[PDB]
Symmetry: D4
Subunit: 182 residues, 8 copies
């Protein structure tokens, strides 16, 4: 969820079948990508991918995608116990984000099992863990994320919105926070 490299943009130096090399500031970044994302990319031209940076004791890796929503879905898959980055990429290479989303949403285990490395029991854990996972609400969420409880988060938010109808998401949040700081 929190990493450092959120995207890479610059000249495509190489399109392979499971990754691309994008040169930013003379540095050529290898970012792994599905064949679908890769097909939109042309060597010699400038591109931008939205990335998830993965840091392990013995590796550092970029996984890239067309948009933040797809990148966030990738991270979401990684939140399932037993689902690592390769598998998550595998899954998205077989089912594009929309299709992967609906499969999970509809609990389509047969679809899921079509992915190498996802057995039936694995498919089910995924569906179970992810089924539900695929102004006012965003704000409540931010508060919750900061540690606040749904109850109190909602109340500060409703009060803030009530007093100020022009409120944007950020202002609402800063007003709510200010009240919660009590």
């Amino acid at each position: 969820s929190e990493f450092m490299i959120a995207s890479v943009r610059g000249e495509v130096l190489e399109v392979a079948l499971d990754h691309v090399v994008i040169e930013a500031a003379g540095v050529g970044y290898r970012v792994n990508a599905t064949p679908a994302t890769l097909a939109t990319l042309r060597q010699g031209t400038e591109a931008r991918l939205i990335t998830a940076m993965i840091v392990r004791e013995d590796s550092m890796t970029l996984y890239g995608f067309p948009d933040g929503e797809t990148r966030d879905l990738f991270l979401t898959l990684l939140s399932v116990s037993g689902v690592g980055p390769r598998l998550a990429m595998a899954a998205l290479a077989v089912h594009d984000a929309p299709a992967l989303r609906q499969v999970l949403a509809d609990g389509n285990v047969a679809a899921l099992t079509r992915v190498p490395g996802i057995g039936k029991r694995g498919a089910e854990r995924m569906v179970l863990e992810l089924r539900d996972k695929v102004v006012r609400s965003p704000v409540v969420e931010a508060l919750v994320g900061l540690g606040f409880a749904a109850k109190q988060a909602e109340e500060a938010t409703d009060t803030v919105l009530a007093a100020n109808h022009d409120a944007t998401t950020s202002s609402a949040l800063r007003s709510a926070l200010s009240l919660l700081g009590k």
Copy 2:
């Protein structure tokens, strides 16, 4: 930096590509850096415009993260929070999202545990450990120099002496010169 060491990425500047509620993406040299930030810092930021945030880089076996702030003082305060046992980066960000640096500073300074407990994840006993550990920690020529010496390992006593001698002999002395003169003497030459 502050009571939380030395890191590599001290700031990121360039085009704001995205303002979310708990982070921004700032593009430097085609690289889009995610830096986590309070809603207060975030509000000054506009997508499509250039921005600069002063950052703390956090390195763990399984992650690397930037936390960003309007100024070095606020960034140093964040690092300072992390020096308390049981206070990690999320919580420290949490604390600063609820109380802006000035307010957080005074709370700690005044030992306002009630204020502190208003932060999700900070209980009363946690609040107190914080106040205790940080009360004196929140906040000239002669003093900065002594501190640099102390930081290098020198003892207050000897550090102050080298510094007073140096400043006595040279009244024009700047902080760096004073420090280099003091060091020279302490090297016993």
Copy 3:
């Protein structure tokens, strides 16, 4: 890349600031990257001029290192060496400093253990493990596609079938299209 995974820095390009005998410093965006390289690769490099090396990034708990080479094939060969148990980055660099990629390739291919043993740190039993592990490993439309599928986890049998079907239906097929068509079928849709 090769039998040694996926990393982040695939190349570095910019001004050569220093050519030493076992590495060069290439400045990209004001950042001077040390990349280790064979004397052979180094000789093509001139300080003061712009260069580009294709790199393997190595990440360990206590280090981060770039190894650089003239082309992707040579870089992939390096990674391949690292896939042998007991062969680390220094040794692999050592091996390529003594035998250039082509020669190293043929040595392994021909199982030339005497050639191999000429490398400091490669004994006879080490040489043999290498030849054994790498003999078939050194080195189209249909085959690259099958391989990508296999890499994604698919079995040779099914991978070849999807691929032949795809190529049969579409003779204009490129490697990527073939792969996307094959994948689509394998998704069973």
Copy 4:
């Protein structure tokens, strides 16, 4: 000895007493430096420091210096058991590279002990470990570094130099290597 970031160049954004911030490509790099190196630096101007990058499980740090020789001396200090980066920086902040070099060379333990954190027994281990440590030879060394033994390294080198008097360090090394590949 082998790390990734060998220098940082760009605009000085801040000079402190124990570090500087140098902005390269919009990225502000904190590099720790002695008060001596720091004094040559002016905020608002472009600078370049030669750096040692230090990577630990829980940190990544740049230590900067005016030249490669000084940076290499820093790394050399770290090769002594018990001498970490802070201490090494401490040592160089008290004795500039030349002076530190001579102290070690002359085994001046009293000088050495003037450094906070270096006791007499520590001073001695240092002197002992480092006393000796502060065309034809460079080449032999490269070969040795690659794993070759002094004996054979010297022989390939002498033979190469003998046959080609115009030989540069790199050519000699590539010729020697070629012979050694036998």
Copy 5:
């Protein structure tokens, strides 16, 4: 043991030196072993008398702990709980302190999430992951043998065949003999 591997200390027997509410100390060979146990298991234990508990040994970088139970089945159930992601030893002990093995078994078997949620630290979504992962997991001659084969790596298909052949030829067969005969055949001899 169960879905939680292989360990070294499978039981401890000797004099009860102390019965507390969440552990007992049992002295074997002058060594006093602390073994953590449910209040239910603890109640059968009397200081000054000899006892034997069947244990799971837990080894972590910074700890070594014994958890003890009246029988192997209960101990195996504990290990099984630990196979669920997010369920550690304290929680598993917690769960068994609230629902005795039989009751815990049935709860999981019947997917009784309400029962499960009665356990501190088990939320509804946690309860469900448990039920899902463990529903089939709670609970002959031919079957134990097949399982041992499977455990050794053999596939159900081939494991069953070797086993049926073995049992057909030898009706007197015990579980071990069957397994050794089956193995012998599978070695293809």
Copy 6:
């Protein structure tokens, strides 16, 4: 709090100043102990110490004491950030458990600071963290320890005790648990 070796009993083979060797079943266990605990021990005779077993990646160590209460106080000291086993032993070697207890209880920082390695700010963190730390209640605690909340723990307990006055600590706990299993 939970470790494996809770005591060692058998023949004293050696009494040193900072540890003893106690032989159980032909195995000679080194257990570190304060000079006070050590003085009660005689080589050639049988002894029993109550121990805390400490397991780290690169060591395994027994610390022994006359009784469980003293052993538990040792573990309690280790719960303070910055206080490791040596220091904790140091502290108890300077102030016996009772005295150490009261010092902490009375916030006697001067007393505390008399311990090598405990500065004033360290002394205070200790006092702060430990000041409060030195049938019905034990039961509530067990329940709380199992994860139950004070409120509900107390209620199950009071109800159990009310219905059964003969109740022992264990029975009360098993009855309470049974109700809480609902």
Copy 7:
């Protein structure tokens, strides 16, 4: 090669299909064993197995065998990259030590591949690594093991044996060592 628990002896409390529990001094040790070794064991009776102790960050495990030679072969299998304890046990459960030995010795890859988890390329690495691996010599070896080189080891040994014909393995080694200490 060097571990702590070299055998366990005492009452068999349980014989399963993939392990036994042997109670020594009131402690019940689980030792994993092949079905062949297990068949010689009877619950209620005393037994002794020769064991390899395996220590990992997150586990400690005993693997037992009838004799030291079989236990040493197990450790030998573990010296192959890619062959862990389960697999090694698997291998010995399919081919008894003698048969496993000869298979490796004869490079019988087909035999080897009959083991679940051993593919052809795995089988070959094994054969390659292990083919050769299955008074005077033992002594030379001990010396070599201590770090001495074959040449010098043999010479000290021959000289020692020459002077003393009655020499046992240990005496020869102690005499040789004494000479080598020069």
Copy 8:
């Protein structure tokens, strides 16, 4: 023990089950302990008889090992060797197999680098680091007490004073009593 800390298994006693050339197996309480030992220590050992070795227990992430010796002094010397950077357990055993403790002691004491270099794995520069680090380290009532105090963290100055005062007042003083009296005073009571 010595300059190598505190461990758990300080000795093993019981029946010798096997004498090999670089280790013995000693059975205590049905448990057969492998303890590694020099050929010199091994020679005093007879299979079938009871023996006792004084041991250093070595704990690493991936191993646990006993090294054994005739007496505590020799065991402490071994631990002392391990305090030298670059000297691990095998090498230390190696060193003691070539030079018995007394001889190893004197070699170090006399700085006999030639003797030292006779050990496989000890080069000249290694020999010297050893001599340097250990020269003073090889080897009363008042002194042992001061040392215990120092070990507890007290400074030589204050440690000696408490000790001299204690011994002055009580001439009958034993090492332990002296230490407990000294400690009592230092507690400032």
